[PDB]
């Protein structure tokens, strides 16, 4: 009892495989199934310290009220763990097997769901998958902790909007925002002199970072958006898989901020209840929603992502292809359409071949991306097109 449980997962064959029975044996029990739920997710790439963080989340949820829940400064990090043995990189969602019930300030009794959500981003291949998982994760989650490494890279925002897009695609679309809360968690922040560790520093840094979209429609998607800056834990944590050592051996700033961060996220008040279309949700509602969403993504198709490179080339060649088709069409009409139509089912061919060739030389001569085998496909397009402009011969 009490361990991590795989609930969603993409397979090699890009097949999203949900585990409904395990999804049931934890969230559909008579004990939680009727309580309104708060689902906390920690989402990011593989090997970014998500499980390390989620362990401390446990340390707090299991010793919540009381103590140095963070633990004895001189004993090792003991207890329940999401870290398994030989870690395999996987795309999907894991949840913690034990739901927590705890008491809100307003006497409410509430079910607390932790999810690890993990994606890959190693190729146009795995991207689509990851975005789909992140999309799902976020639309069943009450708080998405987007766990990012040193900064907020163009990538990270790009990817964020993307999976944000995927979510709306599967959603009705009220006059409420689609999702609840987002938290940009920046790990191993190393510029406390520019922006300070924590939420204050986060806020500011995020501000300045977001003002670089010549937008923040991320704000259209989320009711609440915050940012926390977390320090490097130190080399012992950083370079040791399965860390093991005393609290002491972790950087002191790191732990001091962890201490504000976990309760910041998980303290009874800050605990925030999942909801959809303006309606607070119950563990069971969740499961059926999760199932609903997944059902969709399986039926109708998710737009394959087109990368910056592939796309920038496609635009490069097309511009040649069009520049060329242009100077052909213009010279042709100059002498073939309007008050000009002096007939002649030959010489029509002659000027055509004459011009078509000038365009081809025009195109082919242009410096362009991707090279021969790639551009040739566009040269062909250029050709079959001016031939369609060649049915500019009627009468």
Ligand X SMILES: Nc1nc2c(ncn2[C@@H]2O[C@H](COP(=O)(O)OP(=O)(O)O)[C@@H](O)[C@H]2O)c(=O)[nH]1
- Does residue number 4 form part of the binding site for ligand X (CB under 6 A)? no
Annotated binding-site residue? 237: yes
Dihedral over alpha carbons 250, 253, 259, 264 (to 10 degrees): -130
**Do residues 115 and 95 make contact, with C-beta atoms less than 8 angstroms apart?**
yes
Contact by Cβ (8 Å): 384, 391? no
Alpha helices in the chain (DSSP H): 20-27, 50-62, 124-139, 154-169, 199-210, 218-221, 235-239, 252-266, 283-299, 308-333, 348-365, 372-388
Q: In the complex, which residues of this chain contact a copy of itself (CB under 8 A)?
A: 47, 121-125, 127, 149-150, 153-155, 158, 161-162, 165, 168-170, 190-193, 212-214, 231-232, 234-235, 238-239, 241, 251, 300, 303-316, 319, 367-371
Query: Which residue from 134, 166, 205, 243 is in contact with ligand X, where contact means CB under 6 A?
Result: 243
- Give the nearer residue to ligand X in terms of CB position, either 7 or 287: 7
8 Å CB contact between 235 and 66? no
Contact 150/190 with Cβ under 8 angstroms?
yes
Q: Is 49 known to sit in a ligand binding site?
A: yes
Question: For 123, how many CA atoms within 13 A lie in the half-sphere containing its CB?
Answer: 3
Q: How far apart (Å, rounded) are the C-alpha atoms in residues 70 and 160?
A: 31
Residues 6+ apart with CB under 8 A from 135: 163, 164, 166, 167, 170, 297
- Are the beta carbons of 120 and 89 closer than 8 angstroms? yes
Residue placing its CB nearer to Mg ion in the complex, 45 or 229? 45
Residues 49-78 that bind ligand X (CB under 6 A): 49-52
Q: Are strands 222-231 and 279-280 parallel, antiparallel or unpaired?
A: unpaired
Nearest distance in Å: CB 347, a copy of itself? 24
Which is closer to ligand X, CB of 4 or CB of 285? 4
**Position of minimal CB gap to ligand X:** 49
Is 47 part of any known ligand binding site?
Answer: yes
Q: How far is the CB of 61 from a copy of itself (least distance, A)?
A: 28
Closest among 222, 212, 220 to 184, alpha carbons compared: 222
Q: Closest by alpha carbon to 355, among 373, 376, 338, 333? A: 333
The answer to whether 188 contacts ligand X (rule: CB under 6 A) is yes
Between 106 and 300, CB nearer to a copy of itself: 300
Number of residues interacting with ligand X: please give it, by CB under 6 A. Answer: 18
Q: How many helices (H) and strands (E) does the chain have?
A: 12, 10
284 annotated binding-site participant: no
Residue 240 as a binder of ligand X (CB under 6 A): the answer is yes
Is 364 annotated as contributing to ligand binding? no
How far, in Å, CA of 189 to CA of 358, rounded?
57
Known binding residue 354? Answer is no
Minimum separation from the CB atom of position 82 to Mg ion (A) = 6
**Which one among 71, 167, 178, 233 touches ligand X, defined by CB under 6 A?**
233
Strands 37-45 and 143-148, how do they pair?
parallel
Contact 9, 90 (CB under 8 A): yes
Among 14, 25, 83, 361, binds ligand X (CB under 6 A): 83
Q: Does 241 bind ligand X (CB under 6 A)?
A: yes
Interaction site with Mg ion (CB under 5 A): 51
184, two tokens:
């940009």
Residues present in the chain in total = 395
Q: According to the annotation, is 51 in a ligand binding site? A: yes
CA–CA dist 278, 106 (Å, integer): 20
State in angstroms the smallest separation of the CB of 3 from Mg ion.
13
Q: Could you tell which of a copy of itself, Mg ion, ligand X, none binds residue 46, using a CB distance below 5 to 8 A set by kind?
A: ligand X
Q: Which stretch binds ligand X (CB under 6 A): 46-54, 129-137, 162-170, 376-384?
A: 46-54
237 makes contact with ligand X (CB under 6 A): yes
**118 assigned ligand-binding residue:** yes
Residue closer to a copy of itself, measured from CB, 214 or 338: 214
User: 167: helix, coil or strand?
Assistant: helix
390 makes contact with ligand X (CB under 6 A): no
Cβ closer to ligand X: 212 or 353?
212
187 binds, among ligand X, a copy of itself, Mg ion, none (CB under 5 to 8 A by kind): ligand X
Task: Check the annotation: does 50 bind a ligand.
Answer: yes
Q: Which residues are annotated as a binding site for Mg(2+)?
A: 51
Q: Which residues are annotated as a binding site for GDP?
A: 47-52, 118, 187-188, 237, 240
List of residues contacting ligand X (CB under 6 A): 46-52, 83, 187-188, 190, 232-233, 237-238, 240-241, 243
């Amino acid at each position: 009892k009490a361990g991590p449980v795989q609930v969603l997962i993409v397979k090699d064959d890009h097949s999203f495989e949900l585990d409904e029975t395990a999804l049931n044996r934890i969230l559909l029990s008579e004990a939680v199934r009727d309580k309104e739920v708060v689902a906390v997710s920690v989402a990011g790439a593989f090997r970014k310290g998500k499980s390390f963080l989620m362990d401390f989340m446990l340390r707090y949820m299991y010793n919540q009220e009381s103590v140095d829940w963070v633990g004895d400064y001189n004993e090792p990090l003991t207890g329940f763990s999401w870290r398994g043995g030989s870690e395999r990189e996987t795309t999907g969602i894991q949840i913690w097997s034990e739901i927590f019930l705890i008491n809100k300030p307003d006497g409410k009794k509430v079910a607390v769901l932790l999810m690890d959500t993990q994606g890959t981003f190693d190729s146009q291949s795995t991207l689509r998958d990851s975005a789909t998982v992140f999309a799902l994760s976020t639309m069943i989650s009450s708080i998405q902790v987007y766990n990012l490494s040193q900064n907020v890279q163009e990538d990270d925002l790009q990817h964020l909007q993307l999976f944000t897009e995927y979510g709306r695609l599967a959603m009705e679309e009220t006059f409420l925002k689609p999702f609840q809360s987002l938290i940009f968690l920046v790990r191993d922040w190393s510029f406390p002199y520019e922006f300070s560790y924590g939420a204050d520093g986060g806020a500011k840094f995020l501000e300045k970072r977001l003002k670089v979209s010549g937008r923040k429609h991320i704000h259209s998607c989320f009711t609440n958006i915050s940012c926390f800056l977390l320090p490097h834990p130190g080399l012992k944590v950083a370079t040791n898989p399965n860390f093991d050592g005393k609290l002491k051996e972790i950087d002191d700033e790191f732990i001091k901020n962890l201490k504000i961060l976990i309760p910041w996220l998980l303290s009874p008040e800050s605990l925030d209840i999942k909801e959809i279309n303006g309606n607070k949700i119950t563990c069971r509602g969740l499961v059926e929603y999760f199932k609903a969403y997944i059902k969709i993504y399986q039926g109708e198709e998710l737009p394959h992502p087109k990368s910056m490179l592939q796309a920038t080339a496609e635009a490069n060649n097309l511009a040649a292809v069009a520049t060329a088709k242009d100077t052909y069409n213009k010279k042709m009409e100059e002498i073939c359409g309007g008050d000009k139509p002096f007939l002649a089912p030959n010489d029509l061919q002659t000027k055509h071949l004459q011009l078509k060739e000038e365009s081809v030389k025009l195109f082919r001569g242009v410096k362009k991306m991707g090279g021969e085998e790639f551009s040739r496909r566009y040269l062909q397009q250029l050709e079959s097109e001016i031939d369609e402009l060649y049915i500019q011969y009627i009468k």
